[PDB]
Amino acid sequence: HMRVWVGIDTYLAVLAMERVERELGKVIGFPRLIRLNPTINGAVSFLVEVDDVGELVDVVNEVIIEPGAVFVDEELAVKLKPFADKAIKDVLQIDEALFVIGKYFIPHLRHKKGRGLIGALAAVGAELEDFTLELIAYRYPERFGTEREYDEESFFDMDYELYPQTFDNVDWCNDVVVCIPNTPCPVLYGIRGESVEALYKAMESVKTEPVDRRMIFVTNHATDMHLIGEEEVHRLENYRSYRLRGRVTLEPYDIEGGHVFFEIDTKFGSVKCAAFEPTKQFRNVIRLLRKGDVVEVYGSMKKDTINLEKIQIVELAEGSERELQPGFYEVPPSARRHLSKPLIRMNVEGRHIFR
Ligand SMILES: N=C(N)NCCCCN
């Protein structure tokens, strides 16, 4: 009656859970989908209770044989907490992962360099203060790689009935069904929501080709777990994401490609921000900024540039009737990054929500 956490680095995890739940023991609660630093990113972890940890390792390996895997006890699980934090909000080297695995004799399956190990350990050690659920439907093997068939309208009807119990599944303004991937992966669709109830209802209203397997995951998606407040650092750096307050010093200007840039003066000096082309209408908002506007930006730092996920216009330049209204703005659903918390999940005022 041993309780162990499996860390893998989602389809394969589901196949693995299956064999566990049928040949070695049960699975406690909901499996977990953890995303790592978005600038460097998924990894799955699940709690199980078997008798022979060695047996459990034997299974998973066969499954992986038809990649990093870790098997830690609920005990060590709490220790990996910091490793998980650094893997999500900072940068880790595969050395640091090999160290932990070595220090606590964590049984594992290593392949080559073993960069799958960082995710495997991170998935197990991640402590979720906030979280969201995701229902992932899979296709039958026979259809992997072919074109997904589904009724676009059914997803829009579904969001119309469930939103916000389910969210960021479709994009009305840009007319896109964002919960459906366009890759050779086994995933048919991935609906995000606030509960099993809503997700189950969603799965029942949506129309698509026959769904083979399905799994509701607990994830750090849409939580803002990657953001570092500016009161926590002395200097900013690339490959990290922040929530910075600043004052516009250089007004918006477009560049080749449909992107809009500008700069803000901050406790750290001037910082350049951007609203790349995929953000669509969100650029309309950005183009209205003016020298003097005080704001608070949220985003990943890359090449010394904040890649806007959302922004808050705190104060409009003192000396102006402008179109810009104070309050929150965010990229449309189709430009949403996995870890970005959507305004519909934030109990704040002045939220301008684009559905
Ligand atoms: N609804 C989802 N499962 N994902 C939404 C992703 C939006 C950015 N591509």
Curated annotation (Swiss-Prot):
Location(s) in or outside the cell: Cytoplasm
GO CC terms: cytoplasm
GO biological process: tRNA wobble cytosine modification
Class in the EC hierarchy, top level: ligase
Keyword terms: ATP-binding, Cytoplasm, Ligase, Nucleotide-binding, tRNA processing
InterPro entries attached to this UniProt entry: NA-bd_OB_tRNA, TiaS, TiaS-like_TCKD, TiaS_FLD, tRNA_Ile2__agm2C_synt, Zn_ribbon_TiaS
Entry EC number(s): 6.3.4.22
UniProt DNA-binding residue ranges: 243-304
Reaction catalysis annotation: cytidine(34) in tRNA(Ile2) + agmatine + ATP + H2O = 2-agmatinylcytidine(34) in tRNA(Ile2) + AMP + 2 phosphate + 2 H(+)
Major place of residence: cytoplasm
Superkingdom of origin organism: Archaea
Molecular function GO terms recorded: ATP binding; ligase activity, forming carbon-nitrogen bonds; nucleic acid binding
Effect of mutating R139A: Decrease in activity
Gene3D superfamilies: 2.40.50.1010, 3.30.70.2200, 3.90.600.20
Coiled-coil boundaries: none
Disulfide-bond pairs as recorded: none
Effect of R192A: Decrease in activity
Free-text function comment from the UniProt entry: ATP-dependent agmatine transferase that catalyzes the formation of 2-agmatinylcytidine (agm2C) at the wobble position (C34) of tRNA(Ile2), converting the codon specificity from AUG to AUA.
Family of this protein: Belongs to the TiaS family.
Protein name in the entry: tRNA(Ile2) 2-agmatinylcytidine synthetase TiaS
Organism: Archaeoglobus fulgidus (strain ATCC 49558 / DSM 4304 / JCM 9628 / NBRC 100126 / VC-16)
Gene (name only): tiaS
